[PDB]
């Protein structure tokens, strides 16, 4: 009741012993009495099964009493019982060859599904459990699917195919394209030349990609502003579109959004969405842009934080000298009746010093 579980294309090698160490008559026949395979004296026979051009044994081992059935380039139909008669006495073997694909031989998205089928032969029931290399794992029968990739998935998959008590391992390379990051956020003031920064990880592909970035200005719901790129290899350009600000795009590939002024009203979030192809998806990957304006209107002051701020966070204005001059927790802070020093605006939350934009006082 000796079972082997085979891999489709791979090899296998049945095993066969004699008592003693000396070629003897074998033959390999299948549950049909179909012969496989077996000995004329020191000659190889092959018989009239589907296996003939894929059946060999090893004439090595005969005058060590070792028959071996070895099957290449396995198929799901060989699955059947196989017997070697040898001295008059009959070892038998159940081989079970399986398979296992993912329903896509192509780069997927991060977000898109994964989905394993396991190819069995009739009357086996396995169970499967297969486990990528940020440790996600997934369990079945027939099919395993995950509904979502995670960037951390890529790579190769290790999977287990459970039957009989025995089991056999397949490796499956999935290789997905994603952002290498999720909300980029940049803290600027009022002035300060803003920069924007989105990688991918190189690939090569035909006629393949074009977007977008779409931006939610803070109050100016006067949206549909946006930036247009169409991008083919090393070698990115706007399709069309920018207008309003004078944001700059690269040439090159690892894309950089540029802000010449971090005027004001340029503060708010923004998704940047990327979709390319040969069976497409859209990546997307958050952007978002917070300004600071300190400045003393006459002989009193104020400076105020705009964009994506935090419930959590803290402003601040000091002279730098002596401490706290107005602390709290809004984005329009003022300071009636300030005292010569360079005085120091900030921005925070919890602790760490968010935006820090320094102006000095007169008298």
């Known amino acids: 009741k000796k079972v082997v579980l085979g891999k489709k294309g791979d090899t296998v090698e049945l095993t066969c012993t004699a008592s003693q160490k000396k070629s003897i008559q074998f033959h390999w026949k299948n549950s049909n009495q179909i012969k496989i395979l077996g000995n ?24 060590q009493g070792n028959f071996p059935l070895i099957i290449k380039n396995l198929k799901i139909e060989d699955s059947d019982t196989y017997i070697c008669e040898v001295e008059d006495q009959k070892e038998e073997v159940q081989l079970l060859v399986f398979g296992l694909t993912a329903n896509s031989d192509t780069h ?11 190819e069995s032969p009739p009357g086996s029931s396995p169970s499967v459990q297969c486990r990528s290399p940020r440790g996600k794992n997934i369990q079945g029968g027939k099919t395993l699917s995950v509904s979502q990739l995670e960037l951390q998935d890529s790579g190769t998959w290790t999977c287990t195919v459970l039957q009989n008590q025995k089991k056999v391992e397949f490796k499956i390379d999935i290789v997905v394209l994603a952002f290498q990051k999720a909300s980029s956020i940049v803290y600027k003031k009022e002035g300060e030349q803003v920069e924007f920064s989105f990688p991918l990880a190189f690939t090569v592909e035909k006629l393949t990609g074009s977007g977008e970035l779409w931006w939610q200005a803070e109050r100016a719901s006067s949206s549909k502003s946006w930036i247009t790129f169409d991008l083919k290899n090393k070698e990115v350009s706007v399709k069309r579109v920018t207008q309003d600000p004078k944001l700059q795009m690269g040439k090159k590939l690892p894309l950089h959004l540029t802000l010449p002024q971090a005027l004001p009203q340029y503060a708010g979030s ?17 952007v978002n842009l917070v300004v600071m304006r300190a400045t003393q209107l006459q002989k009193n002051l104020t400076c105020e934080v705009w964009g994506p701020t935090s419930p959590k966070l803290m402003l601040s204005l000091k002279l730098e000298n002596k401490e706290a001059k107005v602390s709290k927790r809004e984005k329009a802070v003022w300071v009636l009746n300030p005292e010569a020093g360079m005085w120091q605006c900030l921005l925070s939350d919890s602790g760490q010093v968010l935006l820090e934009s320094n102006i000095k006082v007169l008298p």
């Open 108 to 118: 997927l998205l991060q977000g898109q599904s994964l989905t394993l089928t396991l």
């Open 270 to 286: 923004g998704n940047l969405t990327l979709a390319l192809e040969a069976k497409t998806g859209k990546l997307h990957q958050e």
């Open 40 to 63: 004329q004296g020191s000659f190889l026979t092959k018989g009239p099964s589907k296996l003939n051009d894929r059946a060999d044994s090893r004439r090595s081992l005969w005058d």
